[PDB]
Design a protein around this ligand. Structure first.
Ligand SMILES: [Ca+2]
Ligand SMILES: [Ca+2]
Ligand SMILES: [Ca+2]
Ligand SMILES: [Ca+2]
Lengths: 548, 548, 49
């Protein structure tokens, strides 16, 4: 069955409006995937050790040592917003929907092709491509999620974002266990710290093979493969942001004195002595009821140690932070509430005609005011007693450990039973969409990498690979490296991701932040005279929501 | 499925006679289309600016600046009379039918072929064509008319007019928005006018993609594609012409004195003093009832400014005129009532064995006397009072604006609530058949380009394209230009256009103008000793019709 | 009775939107003054032919 197609290209996003303001978004994405023969046919256990870098005192954070199993299989990952929606669709969703529901996912492989390269070793010399009709492409869909979960978006290795531009999958590899020690130090530290990779703990070894745990399918041109329809189990993702802070929760103080003339100088006045006011407070000493002192239900947001690194059996790792805005606009603390920074290129944004190999990037800065501005933090001695005396105040300025560039905010952590928090907002187009939950007894309240964490079950991973096209000479009983015909494959991938949205309703007199084409962004949405493209990142939760 | 054909060639025109003089014309047209790989795979936004020409004062009309989106898709356009009928059929329709009804349209693509060119780089060197059996031809039929409407007949780019001669489609491209200024001037104008292309208005940008708005079909040799049957909604087109003018409407004056002997000198005489006659007039002053002064119901035809150019956001454009004859035969005013001029060649008429690249052409001159002869126009002062004195007459001779070559007829416009007019007559074989209506709130009473304007709905456009035949080396992450195997395609197109005609009836004693072979046209209808062909244009509405 | 639009181009499209420039044309001031700035309606291309 060579002369018949086995599939259809479809990259349309359908918006189906239902009853009561609910829409059913059907994002169709098709892509032509190009796939090469594995450079090797065996699994390799490789160690990566860049001690040359960590050898330099004060370079701990640049540690890359790990051990990974290198498989002869490739992963077809489509878990990233850019694969399903273009700037247009996205603007539609973000400007009018109030919440998003991830419903189901299904993919299929069709119109498979396998060619053989022949070196017409004459003159230049030449190269001749031919069809190997009876050759097969191997396909394995790990439904049971036996294999380790490895999101390609984490390393900008998902399918590309352009319907009219071929793409490729990524060689699949996964972490193996290993013990590693690396002691912190600074430029002036003495002696040689302790930078040792101890190896692997036998009680943590887990060598996985696809061949042994997932049925594999062989497809020839005539064949096709389709996944079933997987249904997610995730909480809805909101498309609105909160702006309220503790300072803006509840009943404002009653102004006894109101401005009588226009002018951004004419303020209103509470009109009551800060120690002669009524209200509630959690400060049993003073009688000062102040906007920064009065009681509030709980606490929106929280403080966590910044540029903290922790260490365990495998080595050091940065301490993650779940947090939004908190601070002026061109007045951040990227570190404090962890604004994510995305590095990618060409195939996932970055102008296409770009040269060199320096990735493009951006630091996403959410609209939700749930972050913190450390410099504003301070601490006072129980006696209160203002103006506070230097001996009774710890400030983001006073040093810690005699260190000049470290202070309590750095060590600080105000997470507790009163912490109100929100989930990570979606990041177009470089963000991951869904993520598999940790199989720990107690799970995390959220994941920092994706807004959708399928709990009870997630779509399995799809592995692809060109099956061994051997030559007439092959001897198992001789390490050699099995000479095999240079074969490559081309197939089309088609996926269908279904969402369920809820149309928003206005509730204020005033208009609202809406995504829109300007005379400034204009050319970020259209190709140029050479056909170069790029996909600029966009914000998602533009639109306020009352928090309390 | 490679060894089996998927279609049939049919280029027969069937005439099926019904009851009560109605015939059902079924025009079948088949053609072998040749199609090449796109020179580029991306959409390009290109600007065209020939300021070098408009720089020369007095060359405004030669302005070509515009912006267009260049797509990697080709359009298969068959909307032009020459594609469906040969001189014979046409003579039949034009000589015996009185009116034409455009009923339905359907097309289909079959017996698809895709070959690969290989340069046997030896000696001359050689070239080798091979079949790429598993390759696909992409097909997209824009049913919803999402895409911008682009009639290829407008630029002589429809399918060719010979059943036994292969043809090709045209690269599809469409207008993009842009602001442009160009101020009129004459040879002796001083300073440098104002010739500026300002660019595009963001509020008018509309980048269209086929991939994003029309499902695409992949066909391999075994496959085939067929459109459904589309049904038009258009007014009938008449195949007769009117000759009556205001001067010949109604009851002629009664001749009291009739000629008594033969001779084109012996005239009849009304026999009553022009100021002593009875009748109606719209001239409340005089008592002169004259053949050029007596009342008439309304007005056949109208006067409009000639070689008028108007300007708006995009630049200048000639003011269109809807009008027929009006004037002697070798006594026109091509400009005044806008006789169309058609430029084309080889594939759509023009002797086939022709060399060089100067198009062939003709100015169509309709039989309907609905035009005007300006030189005959004049204007008189309210007092009437003849013979009229130079100071009370504006003539097509007196100058306007002190200009010697401009007069009121040039500025003139007599369109009003009494204007009687006819539609554009069909032009064989270079004319467009149907046209999509403007989506403006108020529409035009007619289109100057085709006699059939499908209002509520029109057949969608058919886009074709060779799908990317990549080589073993392809890297998305590198602008390059994706090296791809030189692939081309050959497929057969078959369309069916159904009309409904009405047989005419004689009502006069005298015979009537009929199309016919002469000793002069004879060789315009047959090939020569070399096999050269050409298709000479013909008139359609030869046959009078009483207007009133 | 309205009809929802459908995208048919690769490129985005002119959309009405709040800027750092129009911002205060949509909210009252410290005195309670209001104003309603005119807006355009047919922002969005349509193929004519
Ligand atoms: Ca921040
Ligand atoms: Ca804010
Ligand atoms: Ca004329
Ligand atoms: Ca005539």
């Amino acid at each position: 069955g060579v002369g018949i197609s086995t599939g259809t290209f479809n990259n349309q996003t359908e918006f189906k409006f239902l009853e009561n303001g609910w829409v059913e978004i059907t994002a169709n994405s098709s892509r032509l995937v190009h796939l090469n023969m594995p450079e090797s046919e065996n699994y390799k256990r490789v160690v990566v050790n860049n001690m040359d870098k960590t050898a330099v005192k004060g370079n701990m954070a640049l540690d890359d040592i790990h051990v990974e199993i290198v498989t002869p299989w490739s992963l077809v990952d489509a878990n990233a917003w850019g694969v399903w929606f273009n700037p247009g669709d996205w603007q539609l969703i973000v400007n009018t929907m109030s919440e998003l529901h991830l419903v189901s996912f299904e993919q299929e492989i069709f119109n498979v092709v396998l060619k053989t390269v022949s070196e017409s070793a004459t003159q230049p010399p030449t190269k001749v491509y031919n069809n190997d009709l009876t050759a097969s492409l191997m396909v394995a869909l790990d439904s049971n999620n036996t294999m380790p979960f490895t999101p390609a978006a984490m390393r900008s290795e998902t399918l590309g974002f352009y319907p009219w531009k071929p793409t490729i999958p990524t060689p699949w590899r996964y972490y193996f266990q290993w013990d590693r020690t690396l002691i912190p130090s600074h430029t002036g530290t003495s002696g040689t710290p302790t930078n040792v990779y101890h190896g692997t703990d036998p009680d943590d070894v887990q060598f996985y093979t696809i061949e042994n745990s997932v049925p594999v399918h062989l497809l020839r041109t005539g064949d096709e493969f389709a996944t079933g329809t997987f249904f997610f189990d995730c909480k809805p993702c909101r498309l609105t942001h909160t702006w309220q802070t503790n300072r803006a929760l509840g009943l404002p103080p009653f102004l006894n004195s109101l401005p009588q003339s226009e002018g951004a100088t004419n303020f209103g006045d509470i009109g009551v002595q800060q120690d002669k006011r009524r209200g509630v407070t959690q400060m049993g000493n003073t009688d000062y009821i102040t906007e920064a002192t009065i009681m509030r239900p709980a606490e929106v947001g929280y403080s966590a140690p910044y540029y903290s690194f922790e260490a365990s059996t495998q080595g050091p790792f940065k301490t993650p932070i779940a947090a939004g805005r908190g601070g002026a606009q061109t007045d951040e603390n990227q570190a404090a509430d962890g604004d994510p920074r995305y590095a990618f290129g060409r195939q996932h944004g970055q102008k296409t005609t770009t040269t060199g190999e320096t990735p493009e990037r951006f630091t996403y800065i959410a609209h939700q005011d749930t972050g913190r501005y450390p410099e504003g933090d301070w601490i006072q001695n129980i006696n209160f007693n203002l103006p506070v005396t230097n001996d009774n105040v710890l400030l983001p300025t006073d040093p810690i450990g005699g260190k000049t560039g470290i202070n309590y905010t750095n060590i600080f952590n105000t997470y507790g039973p009163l912490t109100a928090l929100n989930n990570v907002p979606p990041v177009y187009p470089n963000g991951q969409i869904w993520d598999k939950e940790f199989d720990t007894d107690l799970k995390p309240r959220l994941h920092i990498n994706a807004p959708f964490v399928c709990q009870n079950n997630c779509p399995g991973q799809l592995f692809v690979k060109v099956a061994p096209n051997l030559t007439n000479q092959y001897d198992p009983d001789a390490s050699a490296n099995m000479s095999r015909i240079v074969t490559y494959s081309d197939f089309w991938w088609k996926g269908k991701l279904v969402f369920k949205a809820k149309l928003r309703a206005s509730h204020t007199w005033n208009p609202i932040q809406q995504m829109s084409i300007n005379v400034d962004n204009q050319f970020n949405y259209v190709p140029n005279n050479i056909g170069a493209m790029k996909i600029v990142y966009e914000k998602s939760q533009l639109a306020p929501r009352k928090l309390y």
